[PDB]
């Protein structure tokens, strides 16, 4: 070999040392959102029992049978709220991933003739306690978890039935 080969080797070493990386932040965000999904999954029993025994969905945590929203918190979750049978969990505002800072995800259920189906995805809202339909959460806010930061199973539209 000669000096040109050594210079090319050094250049290739620099190229390898200055390479780019894929987006691992999305995977970390999914891992963190899994905790919120698990936390929100625990309030299903009380809501279902209230609906079965009273004929209408609970309107708040007070008569759902659960604690306050600010008390249901984890390492990455700051609040979980129940409104008209819809469970919404919010992320923390600091010491978390940048992409999922202060964003919300929702869980809701629809009654069938022989079963009760549960859905998970972007935030939704139910107007009346006796309604069977849901719509988008709000048109004047940006607190929505992006599709890329959710599992493939937890991606449902408000029109799903």
């Amino acid at each position, epitope marked *: 070999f000669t000096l040109i080969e050594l210079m090319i080797v050094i250049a290739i070493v620099g190229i390898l040392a200055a390479v780019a990386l894929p987006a691992y932040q999305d995977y970390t965000a999914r891992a963190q959102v899994s905790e919120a999904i698990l936390l929100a999954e625990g309030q299903k029993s009380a809501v279902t029992e209230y609906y079965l025994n009273h004929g*209408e969905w609970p309107g*708040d945590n007070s008569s759902a049978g659960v604690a306050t929203s600010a008390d249901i918190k984890g390492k990455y979750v700051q609040s979980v709220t129940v409104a008209n049978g819809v469970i919404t969990a919010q992320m923390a505002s600091s010491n978390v991933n940048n992409e999922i800072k202060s964003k919300k995800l929702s869980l809701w259920a629809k009654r069938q003739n022989g079963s009760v189906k549960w859905f998970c995805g972007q935030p939704v809202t139910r107007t009346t306690a006796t309604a069977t339909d849901v719509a988008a959460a709000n048109g004047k806010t940006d607190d929505k978890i992006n599709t890329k930061h959710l599992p493939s199973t937890c991606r449902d539209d408000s029109s799903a039935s």
Partner: nanobody
Amino acid sequence: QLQLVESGGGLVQPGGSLRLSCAASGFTLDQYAIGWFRQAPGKEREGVSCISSRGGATNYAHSVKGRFTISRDNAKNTVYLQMNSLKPEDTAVYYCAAGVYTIVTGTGPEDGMDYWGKGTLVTVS
């Protein structure tokens, strides 16, 4: 039949306070949810606040959150709405309705109410 009468309207300077009251005569309001609605001049009617039958569930609108407070009394069939830090944009006609519990930030808030009131006029200078 059931009739709703509102009271407490008037004129209040900006930065002041006002209290409303929606009450019924001859009937008991214990199995119904009381909600407040506001209609601006030349604008469609919207929702402000709503309270549950047993006074444990409350929800307010985005613009009025933090400044309005809703309370319910069961010994006397009356519902109170406290207004604080008034603004010129809050001048409108206020209504009170009874029916099923509703979220004031959803599509068609009026679909769950079966009783209505005449309404009162509130003006902010």
